[PDB]
């Protein structure tokens, strides 16, 4: 990978943040379409860190969400922005 | 307003869908930044339809989310796409 990871806003353990970056790297190598990248990441996080996660992947969006404490990350990987958080 | 509403995917009562469009119309008239539009819509839906809602507003994004039955809408209003759903 030559993609630069830049974590913009996180409320999350360091190991979980690293796992989000690693998971997104695998998603981007397999899939080109944003919704497919998002589904890969969401499903992995549901498995490793319990339901219920939600994932948005894109180049132009804003958001207002509610998340469980310690289960939120917003980061860039290359030119793609990724929002990943747990609620409900 | 001259913005065209196109509901792409909804699991939601007709009246709630109309309220999402009306709320987003008010948000777009007041605010220019996607995150501020999203916050306006999320807060109105938490008030009218109970917590906990999440809102994404943008022109380029894909998503994979989990939502409570009958509480999901994805729609365009003008050139902006809006994802609004309840979870947790």
């Amino acid at each position: 990978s030559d993609r630069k990871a830049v974590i913009k806003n996180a409320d999350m353990s360091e190991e979980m943040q690293q796992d989000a970056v690693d998971c997104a790297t695998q998603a981007l190598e397999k899939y080109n379409i944003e919704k497919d990248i998002a589904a890969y990441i969401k499903k992995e996080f549901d498995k490793k860190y319990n339901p219920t996660w939600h994932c948005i992947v894109g180049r132009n969006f804003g958001s207002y969400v509610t998340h469980e404490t310690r289960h939120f990350i917003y980061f860039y990987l290359g030119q793609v922005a990724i929002l990943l958080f747990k609620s409900g | 307003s001259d913005r065209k509403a196109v509901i792409k995917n909804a699991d939601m009562s007709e009246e709630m869908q109309q309220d999402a469009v009306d709320c987003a119309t008010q948000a777009l008239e007041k605010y220019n930044i996607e995150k501020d539009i999203a916050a306006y819509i999320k807060k109105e839906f938490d008030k009218k339809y109970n917590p906990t809602w999440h809102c994404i507003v943008g022109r380029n994004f894909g998503s994979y989310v989990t939502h409570e039955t009958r509480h999901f809408i994805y729609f365009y209003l003008g050139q902006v796409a809006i994802l609004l759903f309840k979870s947790g």
Binding site: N9, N60, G62, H67, E68, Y74, L83 | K35, G88
Partner: peptide, 14 residues
């Protein structure tokens, strides 16, 4: 609440 909080994100032009 200590169990949850709201968060905002906004992509930036680069």
């Amino acid at each position: 609440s200590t169990l949850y909080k709201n968060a905002a994100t906004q992509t930036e032009r680069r």
